[PDB]
């Protein structure tokens, strides 16, 4: 039994507008260097799509994550200790440059220095940032599929469309698209840490932030294959790997990560979560894939329980961190309202960056339809985004937790409309989803108004110690 604390993050995808501001600010601060110009610690992908690197969710292809052996024990999908050390020499699964994109630049100076009497208007042509040679044409980028850019049948190769009758969605009237911003999950059972034999990768004890020791890294790169979210990138210039550092310099000072504070949509929430570090192995080893979600919720402790507090203090957690945990917006969203869900829990890493699924326009019909359970507002069954799709993405295929999250947000809307438009109290929708008025009102406070002090509740790390 060892109580640990970590600042979790929840992204409300219902409010995401896919602007990529988060990706730009992270790039400016942390990855505007030769070697990682092509790496986007935080990147946003439009769905349906294959993403960055291409098809990263296809573990049969990339070999990322964990697998459960028939004996109940976990082993990296890419191999046991022996096979790993062997891949220091030969790893046939590493993402190629074409899986990401060849970073480019443009000959802007030609616009300035074009000689007198030029036969045509001077232009700035593309040039590789890797080779430094002229590029005849740009064929790839980190966000090439933005807003359904590309033939649908090609975008539909999206791994999340697995087990889904696609045909109908390849029709204009049934078009749908959402955005998936993502960074490192700073997992509780990181596959990356397990795939680097030297221990260059470690999960900090004070805050759970996963980092790659630059002095210790030797460029073996098994970690790149190991991470199922493909969030570790090789720095081709330094010969070492780098990844999202969860802006620890700011977290240590009680500030939000750069990508959280700069989120234009106000969709990101940061809050402390306490967990029993000794309960992780058991949870990640649960037999059924669809139990991983609930098993992770079971490792999160109640910051208000006197015994938890007592144990936390004994294990070295500062009282200020425990008090922050008691005000955690992330705890409320993941544990209480059940709006936030893990990203691909089946990889068995127990990810710590969770997501609230998005609502969407109702299905197209031509027959305008009639009032429903929620009046003029949508009923969960009529949303145009196939729930099975969201399920493969967030709950190992189990639609129940997703339907509950979506249904609860719709219930809030119904309850609030009755209050603000009809001036009456109508809790029918809330009762149908198991929420009280008090809960709906607090959900509204955190999700709609979302004051700065409510989105980020980050304690400083007590550096004086």
């Amino acid at each position: 039994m060892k109580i640990r604390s970590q600042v979790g993050m929840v992204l409300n995808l219902d409010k995401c507008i896919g602007c990529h501001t988060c990706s730009v600010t992270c790039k400016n601060v942390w990855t505007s260097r030769e070697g990682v110009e092509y790496a986007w610690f935080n990147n946003v992908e439009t769905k349906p799509g294959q993403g960055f690197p291409t098809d990263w969710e296809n573990q049969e292809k990339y070999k990322g994550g964990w697998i459960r052996k028939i004996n109940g024990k976990l082993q990296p999908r890419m191999g046991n200790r022996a096979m790993l050390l062997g891949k220091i020499f030969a790893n046939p699964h590493l993402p190629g440059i074409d899986d990401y994109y060849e970073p480019f630049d443009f000959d802007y100076q030609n616009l300035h220095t074009a000689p007198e009497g030029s036969k045509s208007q001077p232009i700035a042509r593309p040039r590789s940032l890797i080779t430094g040679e002229r590029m005849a044409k740009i064929e790839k980028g980190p966000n090439w599929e933005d807003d359904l850019g590309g033939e649908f049948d090609k975008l539909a190769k999206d791994k999340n469309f697995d087990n889904i009758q696609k045909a109908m969605y390849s029709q204009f009237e049934n078009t749908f698209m959402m955005y998936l911003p993502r960074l490192c999950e700073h997992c509780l059972n990181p596959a990356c840490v397990a795939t680097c034999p030297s221990g260059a990768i470690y999960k900090r004890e004070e805050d759970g932030i996963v980092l790659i020791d630059q002095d210790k890294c030797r460029g073996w790169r098994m970690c790149i294959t190991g991470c199922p979210y493909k969030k570790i990138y090789f720095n081709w210039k330094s010969g070492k790997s780098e990844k999202c550092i969860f802006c620890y310099p700011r977290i240590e000072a009680g500030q939000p990560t750069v990508c959280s504070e700069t989120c234009v949509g106000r969709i990101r929430y940061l809050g402390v979560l306490l967990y029993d570090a000794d309960a992780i192995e058991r949870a990640a080893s649960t037999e059924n894939e669809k139990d991983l979600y609930q098993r992770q919720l079971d490792v999160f402790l109640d910051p208000n329980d006197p015994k938890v507090i007592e144990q936390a203090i004994k294990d070295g957690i500062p009282l200020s961190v425990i008090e922050a945990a008691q005000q955690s917006p992330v705890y409320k969203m993941a544990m209480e309202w059940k709006l936030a869900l893990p990203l691909h829990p089946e990889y068995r890493t127990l990810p710590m960056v969770w997501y609230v699924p998005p609502l969407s326009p109702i299905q197209s019909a031509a027959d305008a339809g009639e009032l429903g359970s929620n009046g003029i507002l949508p009923d969960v069954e009529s949303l145009r985004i196939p729930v099975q799709y969201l399920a493969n993405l967030l709950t190992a295929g189990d639609t129940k937790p997703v339907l509950r999250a979506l249904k609860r947000m719709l219930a809030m809307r119904h309850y609030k409309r009755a209050e603000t438009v009809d001036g009456k109290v109508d809790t029918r929708a809330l009762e149908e989803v198991g929420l009280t008025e008090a809960q709906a009102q607090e959900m509204y406070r955190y999700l709609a108004i979302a004051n700065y002090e409510d989105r980020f509740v980050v304690p400083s790390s007590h550096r004086e110690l």
């Binding site: 616009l111 208007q121 980190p142 807003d147 590309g150 020791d213 504070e261 609502l359 809307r413």
Partner: protein
């Protein structure tokens, strides 16, 4: 371990400075600019905005992906570091200088030599830039200006700069220089087509809309042709969050746009047919909420706030009547007891059948006081009255009135519904005996409206609907055929929208943008949405209304900035010009006009009274003082005074005499005569010649005199008919601009084609201010670091030019007298020019009366050698005359006294004793101190001036904020909210958000229209004859740009004609950021075009293949993006991609590929030229022709040969189509 210190060190910095972005996005976001080792390293948003009410989401953090990437520009490879000049021009300039010690003479020897001139003009856009120096370019620029003013006239010098709200002082810098010397200041709002003519038409206001936080007060929102998440990014959260408050949202776009993702319902009408859907929706609203089950709220609202109760005179025609002008008090005996302006006061019947001239019509605005308000009172007796809406039930008889119908004149590309060009309707009428003894039939705007929508009212009107399923003019079933949108969807949404408005008393809102406003018939698209909002009493209620968002049009401290920008502190008036007409003329796009005024006329119009080229209507409007002119007169305006003297006459009478006899002519009559075109052009805070300007190729050919890609033939070559007012030449004058000066921080497309490029300071290297339509804060741009290399702020650049000019002009220009024409201005007593019809003095229909039937003729004294001293000081006119705007004025002596203490005063010279304007901060403090929205002391005086007109006290709106004075250094500490002012109709209040039309509705201040109410009926002669007196559906126009060139230059691949739409892009704000590597990397690395999968397959085009798009206007090259989200029949090339990055050669023109504006061309609309008529009178950026562009069609095909025309052996060839 210790290695962790590495990332920690990266974050550490020297200091943070507050600044913002001077780009036209409407974002107006404050940022933290981080500096390390004297260099800007990155930026993150400020979050310290004053918080909104506890019940509303706060604004922080705002921002967007483009703004987040600005830092990239500071030390990028595309940064402009030094003044640059075209090599050939520099060679000649220096050779000439060795011959003539006087720069003016030097310039003369060059520009008067056809060969020398042609020499450097053909070098435009063809490389050869060389590093110069400030001293060298300042002398050349100054000499050119002097030479032009002296030999041709001040108005042959011009400057183009838009959206002053994004960086006020930076805009003012050049505008102030030009206004002082008499140069032309070009408009932008109309030119860019962001001005919605429907606003001036309905409210007598340029544009006043709710702030984004007010969307949160709404319970029903429709996003119509507005891509909120992409084009309104920093504000999008208000939209996503209000959904959690129970608000239903609807997205209306033809494609599955980003906005759809955020809504509860997605409706996809055929692009360009939105007015049809709006009509059917209004039809359902009128039927169920006004007629069948009368809404108490809606009925009372339209009775007091619209012109629906006003009476319209019918014109007797052959077998039926036509709706004519509105009845005026002057038409009745004893003029209804109105001695003042009886011809400008509308009439209605009270609820007792008696006629009354209600308070509030425009006639009460001037010549008297205390009755220009919306109190429901008899304008004669002063007693309360209740206006009657419908005559049905008290009519003397029934007349058949004809209504124009265009729903069947569509193009082959859109669905149409054939009915009758003229639909007769049954209307209740009253017989009146006019003051002349004659009889006239009248009916209210109200029943004319109900008739126009096709509502059956108990008569036997066969043109009315018996059901929503009945295919009649404007029923859901009718709209279903035109738009493709299910009739039941139209019906359901209209009901929910109105029902929501009725239950909340107007909290239904429509957010609309360029998707609808950039169409030729933007007028109808908007009046359609506006009518729905008015029928539901949404305008003027918090949480409801017309939410029109486009560019950063709202410069809140308007009256404080105006005098600075146009030097109104030293001389009045300045020389404003409406840009669309200006460019249609000088870039000669009129010579290729294919649209005729005749095809735009109402079937009931007298064709013979409307003959001529579209440009003839413009020339006619100009001579009548409706629109401005530039150049103004066919002769140098600085030489007119000397002749008036020799002829023993004063300048004005001499000019009026000369115009009457023809010894002096308006320059617009002879544009290519060699003396009537602009010769010097300043461009800054703009990428006109390379993205903004529609008809790109025409501008290259006629303005620059360089190679171009025009494919079609002009008017003469097609035997077409010529203009009746403008001379014609088979070979148009090319290369009109003698000098093109552009100030920028990056080498843009415009820069690439200029003669001189001046390096300007970035937004992080200078001081300025910024405001927006989206929120109420005014905040600053600041210099985190001093300007890099040899860059200077716009203010310092123009100040230096002014200083050099003041020296170079000595001996060439002294204390001159200038004759300036000024069109009849809206918000001035002169706006009551022609009341009953249109008379042209040049046709001998009336006399030439300046300010009434012709423009005002003004005398302006200019002290050229004193230009610099005037530029750097606040003039005496603010103290002698005063300040004001929007029709009101006040004393501002106290503000001038304060400015003398804040800025110090001139110790000597021409401006001795006046407050100084040396720095950008001095100019900012002048704006803040003079404006009512930033100085509470001025706000109260302003509201008091308005109270004289209305007779109601309005000072209470600012009394509680008197004493508040916003200072430049304070906004650097924290952005401040502005003060409630008479310049705007929304309020800055603790309990209610800013909502436009709020004061009209709650303070009873009239809208500045003929009737004083929201004007549903446009009775101006031209509005009537062009069929727009009432809202009617009008299909997209035929630019006839494809037919003549399709298949003419085959490359072997399949071709196809598609609708060319240009919605604004995700990877830039216009062309800004378009060359920024971060944006290029997140997009597709350069110019691309979106195509539906269907069309792509038909053309044999694969995703990312090189394609060519063209028509008679020009051609462009780009890569394709094939998507399912794009509907067949339309193509989208997101606006803003430019001509400097990743573009190969064109197979159609054999030149560098063109831009999206290479395939467009200007085509004006006569109704946007109307002036001298109350709400329809001129105003800089208030009215004028617009640069519509969505009607365009183009030919699309896969490219074959990919040649870069650069000299390397790197060309490609795409495999055939088959």
């Amino acid at each position: 371990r210790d290695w962790e210190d590495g990332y920690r060190q990266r974050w550490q910095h020297d200091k943070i400075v507050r600044s913002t972005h001077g780009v036209n996005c409407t974002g107006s976001c404050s940022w933290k600019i981080y500096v390390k080792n004297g260099l800007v390293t990155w930026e993150t948003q400020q979050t310290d905005y004053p918080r909104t009410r506890p019940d509303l989401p706060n604004h922080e953090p705002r921002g967007c992906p483009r703004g987040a990437s600005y830092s990239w520009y500071l030390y990028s490879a595309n940064r402009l570091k030094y003044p640059m000049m075209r090599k050939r021009l520099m060679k000649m300039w220096r050779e000439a200088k060795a011959l003539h010690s006087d720069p003016v003479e030097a310039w003369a020897s060059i520009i008067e030599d056809a060969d020398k001139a042609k020499s450097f003009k053909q070098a435009r856009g063809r490389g050869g830039f060389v590093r110069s120096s400030w001293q060298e370019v300042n002398e050349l620029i100054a000499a050119s200006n002097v030479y032009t003013i002296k030999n041709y006239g001040p108005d042959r010098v011009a400057g183009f700069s838009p959206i002053p709200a994004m960086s006020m002082v930076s805009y003012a810098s050049g505008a102030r220089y030009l206004s002082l010397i008499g140069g032309t200041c070009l408009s932008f709002y109309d030119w860019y087509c962001d001005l919605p003519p429907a606003s001036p038409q309905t409210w007598g206001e340029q544009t006043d809309v709710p702030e984004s936080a007010d969307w949160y007060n709404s319970s029903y929102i429709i996003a119509w042709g507005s891509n909120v998440p992409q084009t309104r990014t920093p504000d999008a959260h208000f939209f996503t969050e209000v959904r959690y408050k129970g608000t239903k949202t609807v997205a209306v776009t033809p494609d599955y746009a980003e906005i759809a993702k955020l809504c509860d319902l997605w409706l996809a009408p055929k692009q360009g047919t939105d007015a049809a859907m709006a009509l059917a929706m209004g039809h359902v609203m009128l039927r169920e909420f006004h007629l069948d089950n009368p809404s108490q709220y809606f009925t009372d609202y339209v009775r007091r706030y619209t012109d629906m109760p006003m009476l319209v005179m019918l014109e007797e025609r052959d077998g039926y009547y036509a709706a004519g002008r509105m009845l005026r008090a002057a038409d009745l005996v004893d003029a209804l007891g109105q001695e003042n302006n009886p011809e400008w006061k509308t009439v209605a019947f009270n609820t007792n059948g008696e006629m009354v001239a209600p308070n509030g019509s425009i006639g009460f605005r001037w010549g008297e006081k205390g009755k220009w308000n919306l109190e429901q009172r008899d304008g004669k007796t002063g007693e309360e009255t209740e206006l009657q809406l419908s005559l049905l039930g008290s009519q003397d008889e029934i007349a058949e009135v004809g209504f124009p119908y265009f729903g069947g004149d569509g193009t082959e590309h859109f669905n149409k519904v054939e009915l009758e060009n003229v639909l007769l309707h049954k209307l209740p009428v009253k017989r009146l005996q006019l003051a002349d003894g004659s009889t006239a039939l009248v009916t209210t705007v109200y029943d004319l409206t109900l008739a126009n929508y096709g509502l059956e009212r108990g008569l036997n009107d066969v043109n009315c609907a018996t059901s929503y399923d009945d295919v009649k003019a404007y029923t859901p079933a009718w709209a279903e055929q035109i738009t493709g949108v299910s009739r039941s969807q139209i019906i359901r949404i209209a009901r929910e929208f109105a029902d929501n408005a009725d239950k909340t008393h107007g909290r239904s809102m429509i957010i609309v943008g360029a998707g609808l406003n950039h169409w030729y018939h933007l007028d109808m698209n908007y009046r359609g949405l506006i009518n729905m909002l008015i029928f539901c009493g949404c305008v003027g209620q918090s949480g409801g209304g017309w939410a029109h968002y486009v560019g950063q049009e709202k410069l809140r401290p308007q009256t404080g900035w105006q005098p600075l920008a146009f030097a109104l502190d030293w001389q009045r008036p300045a020389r404003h010009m409406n840009s669309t007409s200006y460019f249609y003329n000088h870039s000669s796009q009129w010579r290729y006009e294919t649209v005729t005024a005749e095809e735009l006329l109402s079937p009931m119009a007298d064709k013979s009274r409307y003959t001529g080229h579209l440009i003839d209507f413009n020339v006619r409007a100009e001579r009548m003082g409706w629109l401005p002119s530039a150049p103004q007169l066919g002769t140098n305006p600085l030489t007119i005074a000397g002749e008036a003297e020799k002829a023993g006459m004063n300048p004005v009478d001499y000019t009026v005499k000369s115009l009457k006899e023809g010894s002096i002519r308006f320059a617009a009559e002879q544009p290519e005569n060699g003396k009537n075109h602009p010769r010097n052009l300043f461009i800054w805070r703009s990428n006109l010649l390379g993205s903004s300007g529609k008809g790109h190729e025409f501008m290259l050919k006629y303005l620059l005199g360089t190679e171009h890609g025009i494919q079609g033939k002009d008017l003469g070559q097609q035997g077409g008919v010529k203009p009746e007012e403008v001379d014609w030449q088979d070979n148009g004058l090319e290369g009109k601009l003698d000098l093109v000066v552009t100030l920028d921080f990056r080498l843009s497309s415009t820069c690439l084609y200029s003669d001189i490029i001046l390096p300007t300071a970035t937004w992080y290297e200078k001081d300025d201010m910024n405001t927006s339509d989206m929120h109420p804060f005014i905040h600053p741009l600041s210099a985190a670091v001093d300007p890099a290399w040899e860059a200077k702020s716009d203010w310092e650049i123009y100040k230096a030019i002014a200083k050099k000019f003041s020296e170079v002009c000595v001996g060439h220009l002294g204390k001159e007298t200038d004759i300036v024409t000024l069109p009849i201005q809206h918000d001035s007593a002169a706006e009551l020019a022609q009341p009953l019809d249109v008379k042209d003095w040049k046709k001998g229909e009336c006399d030439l009366i300046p300010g009434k039937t012709a423009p005002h003729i003004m005398v302006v004294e200019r002290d050229y050698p004193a230009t610099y001293e005037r530029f750097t000081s606040i003039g005496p006119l603010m103290e002698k005359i005063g300040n004001g705007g929007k029709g009101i004025a006040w004393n501002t002596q106290s503000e001038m006294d304060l400015l003398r203490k804040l800025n110090y005063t001139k110790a000597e010279g021409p401006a001795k004793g006046q407050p100084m304007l040396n720095t950008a901060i001095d100019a900012a403090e002048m704006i803040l101190t003079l404006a009512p929205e930033t100085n509470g002391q001025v706000a109260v005086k302003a509201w008091a001036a308005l109270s004289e007109f209305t007779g109601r006290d309005h000072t209470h709106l600012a009394l509680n904020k008197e004493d508040e004075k916003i200072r430049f250094r304070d906004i650097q500490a924290q952005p401040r909210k502005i003060i409630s002012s008479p310049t705007w109709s929304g309020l800055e209040d603790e309990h209610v958000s800013y909502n436009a039309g709020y004061t009209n509705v709650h303070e009873l201040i009239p809208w500045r229209t003929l009737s004083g109410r929201q004007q549903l009926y446009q009775d101006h002669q031209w509005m009537r004859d062009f069929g727009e007196s009432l809202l009617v559906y009008r299909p997209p126009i035929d630019t006839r740009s494809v037919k003549e060139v399709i298949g003419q230059k085959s490359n072997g691949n399949q071709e196809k004609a598609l609708n060319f739409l240009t919605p604004h892009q995700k990877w830039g704000i216009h062309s800004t950021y378009s060359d920024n590597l971060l944006m290029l990397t997140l997009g597709r690395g350069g110019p691309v075009v979106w195509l539906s999968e269907a069309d792509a397959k038909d053309l044999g085009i694969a995703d990312n293949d090189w394609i060519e798009v063209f028509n008679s206007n020009g051609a462009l090259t780009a890569r394709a993006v094939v998507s399912q989200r794009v509907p067949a029949g339309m193509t989208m090339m997101y606006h803003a991609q430019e001509r400097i990055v990743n573009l190969p050669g064109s197979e159609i023109t054999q030149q560098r590929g063109g831009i999206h504006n290479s395939v467009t061309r200007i085509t004006p609309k006569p109704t946007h030229m109307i002036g001298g008529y109350a709400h329809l009178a001129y105003g800089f950026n208030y009215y004028g022709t617009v640069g519509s562009n969505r009607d365009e069609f183009v030919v699309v095909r896969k490219m074959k040969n990919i040649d870069w025309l650069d000299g390397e052996g790197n060309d490609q060839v795409q495999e055939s189509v088959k």
